[PDB]
Scaffold this active site. Structure first.
Site, PDB file in Angstrom:
ATOM      1  N   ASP A  18      -0.712  -7.088   1.906  1.00 29.14           N
ATOM      2  CA  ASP A  18       0.047  -5.848   1.964  1.00 29.14           C
ATOM      3  C   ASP A  18       1.547  -6.084   2.078  1.00 29.14           C
ATOM      4  O   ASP A  18       2.143  -5.934   3.153  1.00 29.14           O
ATOM      5  CB  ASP A  18      -0.446  -5.003   3.136  1.00 29.14           C
ATOM      6  CG  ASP A  18       0.010  -3.570   3.041  1.00 29.14           C
ATOM      7  OD1 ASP A  18       0.497  -3.187   1.960  1.00 29.14           O
ATOM      8  OD2 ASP A  18      -0.127  -2.828   4.035  1.00 29.14           O
TER       9      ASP A  18
ATOM     10  N   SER B  84       4.505   2.377   8.112  1.00 30.12           N
ATOM     11  CA  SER B  84       4.111   1.370   7.129  1.00 30.12           C
ATOM     12  C   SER B  84       5.313   0.843   6.346  1.00 30.12           C
ATOM     13  O   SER B  84       6.160   1.613   5.906  1.00 30.12           O
ATOM     14  CB  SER B  84       3.097   1.970   6.155  1.00 30.12           C
ATOM     15  OG  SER B  84       1.919   2.355   6.833  1.00 30.12           O
ATOM     16  N   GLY B  85       5.373  -0.473   6.171  1.00 30.52           N
ATOM     17  CA  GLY B  85       6.473  -1.078   5.439  1.00 30.52           C
ATOM     18  C   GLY B  85       7.645  -1.487   6.314  1.00 30.52           C
ATOM     19  O   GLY B  85       8.477  -2.305   5.910  1.00 30.52           O
TER      20      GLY B  85
ATOM     21  N   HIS C 222       0.787  -1.229   0.000  1.00 32.43           N
ATOM     22  CA  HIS C 222       0.000   0.000   0.000  1.00 32.43           C
ATOM     23  C   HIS C 222       0.821   1.283   0.000  1.00 32.43           C
ATOM     24  O   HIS C 222       0.277   2.366  -0.201  1.00 32.43           O
ATOM     25  CB  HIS C 222      -1.012   0.015   1.159  1.00 32.43           C
ATOM     26  CG  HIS C 222      -0.464   0.524   2.457  1.00 32.43           C
ATOM     27  ND1 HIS C 222      -0.022  -0.314   3.459  1.00 32.43           N
ATOM     28  CD2 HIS C 222      -0.327   1.784   2.935  1.00 32.43           C
ATOM     29  CE1 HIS C 222       0.360   0.407   4.498  1.00 32.43           C
ATOM     30  NE2 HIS C 222       0.185   1.683   4.206  1.00 32.43           N
TER      31      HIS C 222
ATOM     32  N   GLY D 215       3.123   6.188   8.408  1.00 34.13           N
ATOM     33  CA  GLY D 215       4.498   6.484   8.065  1.00 34.13           C
ATOM     34  C   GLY D 215       5.427   5.339   8.419  1.00 34.13           C
ATOM     35  O   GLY D 215       6.477   5.180   7.797  1.00 34.13           O
TER      36      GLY D 215
HETATM   37  C1  LIG Z   1       5.413  11.575   5.658  1.00 33.60           C
HETATM   38  C2  LIG Z   1       4.773  10.224   5.990  1.00 33.60           C
HETATM   39  C3  LIG Z   1       4.935   9.909   7.484  1.00 33.60           C
HETATM   40  C4  LIG Z   1       3.317  10.227   5.477  1.00 33.60           C
HETATM   41  N1  LIG Z   1       2.322   9.920   6.507  1.00 33.60           N
HETATM   42  C5  LIG Z   1       1.027  10.189   6.265  1.00 33.60           C
HETATM   43  O1  LIG Z   1       0.599  11.339   6.284  1.00 33.60           O
HETATM   44  C6  LIG Z   1       0.174   9.004   5.973  1.00 33.60           C
HETATM   45  C7  LIG Z   1      -1.204   9.222   5.700  1.00 33.60           C
HETATM   46  C8  LIG Z   1      -2.056   8.131   5.405  1.00 33.60           C
HETATM   47  C9  LIG Z   1      -1.550   6.817   5.381  1.00 33.60           C
HETATM   48  O2  LIG Z   1      -2.474   5.823   5.066  1.00 33.60           O
HETATM   49  C10 LIG Z   1      -2.914   4.912   6.021  1.00 33.60           C
HETATM   50  N2  LIG Z   1      -2.498   4.939   7.321  1.00 33.60           N
HETATM   51  C11 LIG Z   1      -2.974   3.999   8.174  1.00 33.60           C
HETATM   52  O3  LIG Z   1      -2.509   4.092   9.493  1.00 33.60           O
HETATM   53  C12 LIG Z   1      -1.606   3.116   9.944  1.00 33.60           C
HETATM   54  C13 LIG Z   1      -0.552   2.593   9.153  1.00 33.60           C
HETATM   55  C14 LIG Z   1       0.310   1.609   9.679  1.00 33.60           C
HETATM   56  C15 LIG Z   1       0.121   1.144  10.998  1.00 33.60           C
HETATM   57  C16 LIG Z   1      -0.930   1.661  11.812  1.00 33.60           C
HETATM   58  C17 LIG Z   1      -1.120   1.175  13.190  1.00 33.60           C
HETATM   59  N3  LIG Z   1      -2.118   1.692  13.950  1.00 33.60           N
HETATM   60  N4  LIG Z   1      -0.325   0.233  13.709  1.00 33.60           N
HETATM   61  C18 LIG Z   1      -1.790   2.653  11.267  1.00 33.60           C
HETATM   62  C19 LIG Z   1      -3.891   2.981   7.750  1.00 33.60           C
HETATM   63  F1  LIG Z   1      -4.326   2.065   8.647  1.00 33.60           F
HETATM   64  C20 LIG Z   1      -4.338   2.936   6.385  1.00 33.60           C
HETATM   65  N5  LIG Z   1      -5.234   1.965   5.885  1.00 33.60           N
HETATM   66  C21 LIG Z   1      -4.737   1.109   4.713  1.00 33.60           C
HETATM   67  C22 LIG Z   1      -5.790   0.642   3.688  1.00 33.60           C
HETATM   68  C23 LIG Z   1      -3.884  -0.065   5.218  1.00 33.60           C
HETATM   69  C24 LIG Z   1      -6.592   1.918   6.555  1.00 33.60           C
HETATM   70  C25 LIG Z   1      -7.095   0.484   6.873  1.00 33.60           C
HETATM   71  C26 LIG Z   1      -7.617   2.725   5.747  1.00 33.60           C
HETATM   72  C27 LIG Z   1      -3.811   3.952   5.533  1.00 33.60           C
HETATM   73  F2  LIG Z   1      -4.143   4.022   4.232  1.00 33.60           F
HETATM   74  C28 LIG Z   1      -0.155   6.564   5.660  1.00 33.60           C
HETATM   75  C29 LIG Z   1       0.423   5.188   5.644  1.00 33.60           C
HETATM   76  O4  LIG Z   1      -0.017   4.318   4.958  1.00 33.60           O
HETATM   77  O5  LIG Z   1       1.462   4.953   6.484  1.00 33.60           O
HETATM   78  C30 LIG Z   1       0.689   7.667   5.954  1.00 33.60           C
END
Ligand SMILES: CC(C)CNC(=O)c1ccc(Oc2nc(Oc3cccc(C(=N)N)c3)c(F)c(N(C(C)C)C(C)C)c2F)c(C(=O)O)c1
Ligand SMILES: *[C@@H]1O[C@H](CO)[C@@H](O)[C@H](O)[C@H]1NC(C)=O
Ligand SMILES: OC[C@H]1O[C@H](O)[C@H](O)[C@@H](O)[C@@H]1O
Ligand SMILES: C[C@@H]1O[C@@H](O)[C@@H](O)[C@H](O)[C@@H]1O
Ligand SMILES: [Ca+2]
Ligand SMILES: [Ca+2]
Ligand SMILES: [Ca+2]
Ligand SMILES: [Ca+2]
Ligand SMILES: [Ca+2]
Lengths: 116, 254, 75, 139
Positions: free
Chosen positions: B90, B192-193, B41, B190
């Protein structure tokens, strides 16, 4: 993942049942009687040897004596009782392991009865 | 990372920082000198696949030192089963254009065998998750790499201990929950990954990928991670694959 | 497969046995035990018994609080 | 019947010979003490059938027993041989890294790339300067 079920939580020290004790001996000493409780062995080990209930619970463990027309009781911090008796009279005894600090399952079942 | 600590420089050596056109995008995990594992994602809105950079040995985003190594991302492989905008499958496998040099500050995390991971690693209670993500759900990101110890749950427990939410994504066999439901600690946006790394008898292994959650460290919820064990074969095969022309590659799964 | 039920702790002088139902039909069980923050240790691997002696695990520290779970695996 | 001229005796009637409840009751002359005695007296020795296997020790209780096992055994009746539990699902078969079960013989241990299995057959040692999963600055 497979199907599974969780058990209730279990805290050994607070929940394991106290085993039924056994009166090791009862000897008359003058105008008194010495009643000794056999050491209750437990599953806790320590160098090829099993620890007694006493070794594990220490001060938390006491033994209660039920003897005898009503009944009388005596209690000890060790495994021995020294009670006053009336010469010529016969007495019977029974003991129980107790952990007073518990609220539930605080006592063992009574030991077999032993009489003079 | 919410409620974690700074990972002492060099103590999270497999951590990867992913940049898109110089901007912070996501985290990743180095598993050998040329391959990095991340989340699918993280690439949903990528347009310039040629401006993808992976940084190793990074620690403080505000200062550059001699431990940092940068490499262009030559390829991004994701399961064809993955659906942009959703949560299942993912995972992404990244091929670096040139291999990084392993050093005291750049070390790969071990990709374990599937059975070992399912029968043994899955039962080690705590594992580490890390990243330069948000310190609070809608808050600022971290300048220094953060790390957090989180306990794992079997999915049945996760579901029974989580507050029911209307349109919440299903927790599939390709995911697992880890963390706390008391609102104190969790991975976050953020991160993520990034890696969910498990320590077992002296060695660290990759068991999860920071994937999703309902709002970071929200009461009644746990963080959700991609269950890497389900993709071991898939990953190993692909790492033996031949380089394609385009960057993005949707590979069949299984 | 069917999930175990009525998990009960039978313990006297620390000899500790976990019991459950039902007797298995085309399935086997494996038990796991742990302390709140410790790793899960497996016992009674693929048994068809409806009990599992956990004495050796709980005597490691009788003052700890343990949680056990019974897994059902198709035969 | 000539034995029944001897005055009441807990020792001769219940300890030497077996006695009935009312027999015992006629001695204790009180429901409470009599039943306390009877509880254990008529319970029976569950250890009679020698339930504890592999050299274990049996300790009688009320309508139950406890088996104390030798070090290499466990189970309600010490029926479980600890020496026969060397399988991968049991603490990874004692292997440091990878474990492989082998029906018919014994499990073997293996290592991840970058490591080699030592002589002990269970430990793994690095074969490169920077093996995966190790933190150099702490090593
Ligand atoms: C400069 C960077 C830090 C950018 N950060 C940002 O602003 C930023 C904004 C939005 C964003 O998207 C996003 N963020 C999420 O929060 C997260 C991401 C990873 C882990 C958690 C956790 N609680 N352990 C939460 C999501 F759960 C989803 N979903 C998907 C489908 C999995 C839910 C289920 C809808 C998502 F799309 C991210 C990201 O993906 O890390 C980063
Ligand atoms: C009571 O009997 C026990 C058991 O032999 C003995 O150790 C102890 O010294 C005796 N004490 C008394 C009251 O004589
Ligand atoms: O051999 C097994 C049996 O041994 C003894 O008879 C016990 O009293 C009984 O509980 C057990 O089932
Ligand atoms: C644990 C067992 O305890 C008693 O049964 C002893 O007689 C045995 O030799 C063994 O030590
Ligand atoms: Ca830096
Ligand atoms: Ca008679
Ligand atoms: Ca006699
Ligand atoms: Ca009568
Ligand atoms: Ca009995």
């Amino acid at each position: 993942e497979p199907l599974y079920e969780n058990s209730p939580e279990f805290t050994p020290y607070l929940e394991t049942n106290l085993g039924q004790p056994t009166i090791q001996s009862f000897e008359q000493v003058g105008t008194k009687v010495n009643v000794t409780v056999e050491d209750e062995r437990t599953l806790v080990r320590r160098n090829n040897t099993f620890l007694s209930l006493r070794d594990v619970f220490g001060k938390d463990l006491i033994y209660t004596l039920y003897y005898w027309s009503g009944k009388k009781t005596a209690k000890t911090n060790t495994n021995e009782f020294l009670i006053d008796v009336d010469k010529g009279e016969n007495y019977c005894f029974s003991v129980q392991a107790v952990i007073p600090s518990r609220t539930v399952n605080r006592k063992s079942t009574d030991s077999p009865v032993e009489c003079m | 990372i919410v409620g974690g600590k700074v990972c002492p420089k060099g103590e999270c050596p497999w951590q990867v920082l992913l940049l898109v056109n110089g901007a912070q995008l996501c985290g990743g995990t180095l598993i050998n000198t040329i391959w990095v594992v991340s989340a699918a994602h993280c690439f949903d809105k990528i347009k310039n696949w040629r401006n993808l950079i992976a940084v190793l040995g990074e620690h403080d985003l505000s200062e550059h030192d001699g431990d940092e190594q940068s490499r262009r991302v030559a390829q991004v492989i994701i399961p064809s089963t993955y659906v942009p905008g959703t949560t299942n499958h993912d995972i992404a496998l990244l091929r670096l254009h040139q291999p990084v040099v392993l050093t005291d500050h750049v070390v790969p995390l071990c990709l374990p065998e599937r059975t070992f991971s399912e029968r043994t690693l899955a039962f080690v209670r705590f594992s580490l998750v890390s990243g330069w993500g948000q310190l609070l759900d809608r808050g600022a990101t971290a300048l220094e790499l953060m790390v957090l110890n989180v306990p794992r749950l079997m999915t049945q427990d996760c579901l029974q201990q989580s507050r029911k939410v209307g349109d919440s994504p299903n927790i599939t066999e390709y995911m697992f929950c880890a963390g706390y439901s008391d609102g104190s600690k969790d991975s976050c946006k953020g991160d993520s990954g990034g890696p969910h790394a498990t320590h077992y008898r002296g060695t660290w292994y990759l068991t999860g990928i920071v994937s999703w959650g309902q709002g970071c460290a929200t009461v009644g919820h746990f963080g959700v991670y991609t269950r890497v064990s389900q993709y071991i074969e898939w990953l190993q095969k692909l790492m033996r694959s031949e380089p394609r022309p385009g960057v993005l590659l949707r590979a069949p799964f299984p | 497969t069917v999930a175990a039920y009525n998990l009960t702790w039978k313990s006297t002088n620390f000899k500790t046995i976990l019991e459950w139902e039902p007797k298995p039909v085309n399935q086997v069980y494996t038990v796991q035990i742990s302390t709140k923050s410790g790793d899960w240790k497996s016992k009674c691997f693929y048994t068809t018994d409806t009990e599992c002696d956990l004495t050796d695990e709980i005597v490691k520290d009788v003052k700890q609080t343990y949680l056990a779970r019974v897994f059902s695996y198709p035969a | 019947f000539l034995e029944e001229l001897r005055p009441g005796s807990l020792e001769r009637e219940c300890k030497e010979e077996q006695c009935s409840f009312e027999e015992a009751r006629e001695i204790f002359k009180d429901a409470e003490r009599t039943k306390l005695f009877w509880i254990s007296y008529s319970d029976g020795d569950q250890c009679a059938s020698s339930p504890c296997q592999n050299g274990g020790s049996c300790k009688d209780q009320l309508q139950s027993y406890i088996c104390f096992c030798l070090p290499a055994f466990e189970g309600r009746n010490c029926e479980t041989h600890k020496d026969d539990q060397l399988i991968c699902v049991n603490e990874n078969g004692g292997c440091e890294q990878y474990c492989s079960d082998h029906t018919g013989t014994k499990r073997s241990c293996r290592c991840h790339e970058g490591y080699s299995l030592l002589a002990d057959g269970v430990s793994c040692t690095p074969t490169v300067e920077y093996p995966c999963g190790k933190i150099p600055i702490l090593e």
